[PDB]
Amino acid sequence: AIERNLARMSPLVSVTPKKLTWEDLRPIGPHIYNHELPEVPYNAFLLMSDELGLANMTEGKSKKPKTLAKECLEKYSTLRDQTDPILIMKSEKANENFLWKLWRDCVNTISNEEMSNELQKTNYAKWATGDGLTYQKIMKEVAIDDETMCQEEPKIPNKCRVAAWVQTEMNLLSTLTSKRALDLPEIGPDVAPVEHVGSERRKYFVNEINYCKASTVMMKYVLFHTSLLNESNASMGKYKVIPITNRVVNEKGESFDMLYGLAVKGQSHLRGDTDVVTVVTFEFSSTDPRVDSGKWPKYTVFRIGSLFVSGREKSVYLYCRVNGTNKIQMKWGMEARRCLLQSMQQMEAIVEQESSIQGYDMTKACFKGDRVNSPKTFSIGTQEGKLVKGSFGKALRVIFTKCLMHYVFGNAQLEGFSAESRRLLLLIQALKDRKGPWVFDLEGMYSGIEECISNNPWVIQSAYWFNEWLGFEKEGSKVLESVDE
């Protein structure tokens, strides 16, 4: 019966297989290069590279968050006392007065002598929190009669083009500093040689990440979400002011308590997991928004003084924005230290594979080099159209940054892109290994990938990185094509 059915079945039913060649791999997402579209805006919850933390030398032990922000503003009082608003840039649908009144209410509330960090439920706080904006539920019998009521057409994400602030975020978040931010607790004593190898490996692996920028940005997200979730359940009906805290240690070993800004908690009677609590962020910065205005259409910027940053004077700005989070995303923020393991495992695999080849701990060799071997070098990025060799440390941080950006911009566009693009990745590896790969409906692969490139910065920049990487592989394929033959 099988063979008798296959005889009478139409020839049109087939897989239409075609062997994959490199010119069949057209760059993914043709619309991201089109200038007719608007460039993708910064949409993270907090600032990352542009942040500016007000330092404060302390004993190095926990204090109350209000008292910390008070003593930080005590040190840098020139900015705290600035009640004169110098507005630089303004979000389309924002209210200069309300926002600045809010900032002053936060500053003064935190600066006061009393315990509570609660904020008065004002008319400007009710706008920035979005009070009463929920719609009223009514009976089905009424809505059926009311002919003005209709099913809303759904909001579809906008089609954004490539923006260079992502590239610069990546470039800067991956670089080293002099400030360690991680809060890694203690462990048991080492006994077995494996534990002494691991402990010795951590000195190279961990401090490579700890000293870089992305480590402090991550710890900022974690500790903030940790307290932002606590207020969201403890003080539900109460509007509260929460500081953007993070303790830091410099290379000399002195505990600096950093304050990157102040945030307003909304009304948080969060029943379902996806229920939203709107949060309003007031964050310090050194970046002039007029430089990259396409980056900040969601932000409202003031100018509230100046500081001696790197010896010279630098203008301090206040980036104000109405934002939002939910129970889920606050939890995933508390579980965001795991961005270490995903990048530390990936590179310890390369250290263990290299130790297999040469039969001794190749950690120091990979990072620094040694008597026998040179340091491990990777293709790290481009520079005026040619490759650049970065060290093992940099390749470690680049993955750690990529793992942090997977969270900070984590949504359905990322999942759909990563998954469907990973297929087109594997095919390229088969072409690199010359395993004669065949495809059945390549337009289906592209249609499945390209629908996920809308308005996620990390997706749009990864699609650009993917096409630059795909371009450089095509120049290497000119080596293998004429081998032997």
Binding site: T175, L176, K203, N207, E208, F367, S391, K394
Partner: peptide, 9 residues
């Protein structure tokens, strides 16, 4: 004791 470095710092 490890102190990482780079050609941009």
């Amino acid at each position: 004791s490890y102190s990482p470095t780079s050609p941009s710092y």
